[PDB]
Write a protein that binds this ligand. Structure first.
Ligand SMILES: O=C(CO)[C@H](O)[C@H](O)CO
Ligand SMILES: O=C(CO)[C@H](O)[C@H](O)CO
Ligand SMILES: O=C(CO)[C@H](O)[C@H](O)CO
Ligand SMILES: O=C(CO)[C@H](O)[C@H](O)CO
Lengths: 142, 172, 172, 142, 142, 172, 172, 142
């Protein structure tokens, strides 16, 4: 399974830890920010571009609060980014939403919790079915 | 001040609690989200709330669904909106003070009512304080999307999907 | 068919249950009644539902409050409307079949949801059976009130009272 | 206390029973239909006219289903008539609404229940206060 | 379809009207109280005995309040009597409960409403299935 | 005074409302009925409440289910109990004053909460007034059933049915 | 397996949702917490749940109040109990796997029902993984408090405080 | 105002950050673990001992998951420790409970959120009144 990751200066430290975690678990990781991005708009958009052009369907954005990376990346047509700070949304956003990526705020979420969130996200597949109408509506928007 | 609010069927009860609170606080509320708990689609209400805010019918917006991700993302995908998905007080205050977010998204179903009330109150009480740094971030965010006149102020934008739904195209 | 529904804050939950049922049954619903449970006034929603029916925006209307008396009386006091206050299936069927009532009122706090569902279904399933006898009764009923153009389709009709309310004129 | 009563052919029997009841329990009754009215429109309007002209504030309309008398009399500007089939509305409509009259359907409500309903209605006074805004709204309508 | 009916002095008048209604609708009626029973215990028990010994599965008991006929007849092992005063219970008690009989209070329920209640009761069959456990529990009691 | 109350899963919310009211009125409540809304069986709770009253652990009992018929009938089928099924104030008062009913049954789901409160209050406020006539009726009712020691105070009385349920014997 | 559950009046509805889920999952539930929403005191139910677990009547316990702090602290203050206050899945799993916690506490007013369900499932699914390291921690924890025989299995333990409450000693 | 703080090896880093924060914001801090405690049992008990002996009523315990420190310190008679992961409990536990200390898990809660939680806790006083009955009950337990 492929996973795209990116981060700004505030999310860089955690991004590095997660990358190590992902590699140790056999995941093929595409890091779009070997060096911290200028800001979360740059990192979140970098992850989005790489994702929508790759065969991967899982991505993780890191910044101080998560809110920013989601706010910025969701402006991209076809993109769906979920800010995640607890373990239910971690899987539900993948199951119900397109959740092409999740955003974690390093100033909000501790590392051990972030890992549980990430693993639940990566382990969950989109359910399709009735949920597709909402995704079709979202992909139609700017 | 005018607050527009919306929701999908999973969190109508939580929306009602917030609507009640907002009115008690002195806000004028424009309820757009769904009014009952019959299965419906979060993008419809997120778009309605987004346009109320973007068109000046409302000062700020609040949208909720099970996780908040769906409806807040729908709200964000509109001209003039900066929607912040915040299940906590800290990031909600950050959203208002630093990103001048004008739409707040919350996950009913995952956040307890008392905390939802705190998030809303903190968000509303916060004030945007411009800085050379966040002004630049905001400008970037406001220019990522390409405006689509066919979506702007078009309440029939999702009609094609609604018909496909009525025709059983989206069966499980 | 289109059903307009309304309610005061005391029975919003019962209104939601009926709205859900109507949609499951294939009806299009126009929800006018209050959307949350914040203290408001039944005449506002009774009038809104009445006008939907009278103007042709809805085929029939359903209104509810604690006892149903207040909102159904408000609905009745409008041109083109024959509102039937029915907490039972028997009189509701009579109302539709004999008086061709176009607005059904129910007490959401005195009738249990299962019975409310039964009253609504019975009323909707019933069909007006015209006879020279009931046509005479209906005509007399339609001619009791004297039409007031200042009320008809006037959204600001109750502004005077609402201002007084905000001014604390109606304190307890 | 005073009470205005009236009935069409279907509610006449109970109206006669209630009149005797009220008289026995020290109640000055004004029967506007000593003989059954043509229909419930005639009886309800007769009761309303007498009420909005007398110094009494309580009235009982009798017909087959209750709904008709209320539907008719409520068309009169300033009138407020409540169909009553159970014991809670019996008092609440008086307490909250102007409840100038209650309508009882003899084909719906049994006599013993009718007496409890009537007694509760007669023993309850209008609370006024916040409820007045709603009555002012109603009296303002046609 | 067979229907067993019975009544005491207070429920006799309505019982007679319903009997006429039932005959007009082709129902085979077994009246256990051609003359009013001494009291509701006698009438309700008379209906119960005739029912539990007949091939009929529908019965109607009439008294002033309904409560008494149900309270008394439900003491009989295997009997299930429902006091009915509204149109939802009229069918639900048959669908879910054994509702071997319904009890109508003539001082509570008007005639037109009683007929709707009765017809709904007669038109509804027991659903069995999951509901049988509750009926098995009831029939086990004294 | 001590009031025992019980219910099946269909009306747990209504039971909660009545429990709250009883406590506010100063009554001590023994809640036996089911505590959540998981599918269960009304006879279980009707029997529990019945025995609390018959054994002197409670002064009166109140039982509710969708229609009240199931649970009130279960309560009635116990030694020392006279259970009255009353969806209205008039018959409830009659039940207490004339039949000295010690268990009140109500149909949640068919009676609105405000009316349920009125029925309960009226029932409790009423007082049994013996007369040669009702004393005779009561004596008759108290002697119809044949006591079964295997049922009396046996909480395992329905175990055979509960096992059959767990084994899928009662499938739809 | 047997799960004892308890709660104060603020979160009775959330407790009902969890009770329902546990039963659907095949667990036997002993509901101790308050059954309605009448103002009561969290320590009462925390103690009841704790003793069920400590005495072997239940395998594990779950307690909830507005924030969960009060009732989980009460549960922790009992012999044989290791109560874990967890509003998240991560720490709940740690609590079970490392500290072999036998009582889970959750804030029913701050955590949304969907997340509460997730925390409960995660906690129940987890298994204590003993190591010399955590056995040392657990042993230390089990030896901090000094056993009070007057509290252990004493139902009248709080009578003193309840009497004062009834006497109006704890007015606001 | 005074604040007692302490931490094991996992919470030490954040404890040091918070200490500097508190000092900068005019707060007299009593650090009972200048060097990381052996484990959370040692650190939580150290904080509790110092608290139940000082004139301060606020304390912060730092560890990896929060749960451990609370589980341990709550075993002490008279102590009340609240694990805090969100901003509502941060103040409510102080307002309603004796909240003598809050426990923060560094693997669960990010630093920025931790500061908001801490500030809310420190700015809130115990309401007393009806809540006292519950505190008296707790202090009565082991
Ligand atoms: O949370 C949601 C979308 O993010 C919705 O409430 C859910 O998909 C409805 O099934
Ligand atoms: O029943 C009503 C009017 O008839 C309303 O629900 C009540 O007045 C609200 O206080
Ligand atoms: O009303 C009832 C029995 O008379 C029960 O609530 C119903 O059967 C549950 O499905
Ligand atoms: O959260 C609580 C205790 O920690 C309770 O729900 C609250 O004190 C009730 O007022």
């Amino acid at each position: 399974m492929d996973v795209i990751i990116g981060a700004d200066k505030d999310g860089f430290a955690m991004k590095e830890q997660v990358k190590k975690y992902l590699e140790e678990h056999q995941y093929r990781v595409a890091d779009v920010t070997p060096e911290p991005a200028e800001d979360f708009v740059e990192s979140s958009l970098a992850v989005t571009k790489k994702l929508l052009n790759s065969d991967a369907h899982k991505a993780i954005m890191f910044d101080r609060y998560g809110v920013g990376s989601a706010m910025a990346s969701n402006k991209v047509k076809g993109m769906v980014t979920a800010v995640v700070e607890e373990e239910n949304t971690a899987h539900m956003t993948a199951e119900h939403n397109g959740a092409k990526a999740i955003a974690i705020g390093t100033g909000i979420t501790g590392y051990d919790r972030a890992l549980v969130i990430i693993q639940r996200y990566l382990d969950t597949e989109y359910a399709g079915g009735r949920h597709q109408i909402r995704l079709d509506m979202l992909e139609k928007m700017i | 001040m005018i607050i527009a609010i919306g929701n999908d069927h999973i969190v109508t009860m939580q929306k009602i609690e917030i609507s009640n609170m907002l009115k008690d606080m002195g806000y004028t509320v424009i309820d757009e989200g769904t009014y009952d708990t019959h299965r419906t689609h979060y993008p419809i209400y997120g778009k309605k709330v987004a346009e109320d805010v973007a068109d000046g019918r409302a000062d700020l917006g609040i949208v909720m669904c099970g996780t908040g991700i769906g409806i807040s993302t729908a709200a964000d995908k509109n001209e003039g909106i900066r929607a912040a998905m915040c299940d906590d007080v800290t990031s909600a205050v950050y959203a208002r003070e630093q990103l001048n977010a004008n739409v707040l998204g919350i996950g009913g179903a995952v956040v307890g009512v008392h905390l939802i009330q705190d998030i809303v109150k903190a968000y509303l009480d916060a004030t945007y304080k411009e800085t050379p740094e966040n002004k630049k971030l905001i400008d970037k965010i406001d220019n990522i999307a390409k405006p689509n006149p066919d979506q702007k102020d078009n309440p029939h934008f999702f009609d094609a999907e609604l018909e496909k739904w009525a025709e059983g195209v989206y069966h499980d």
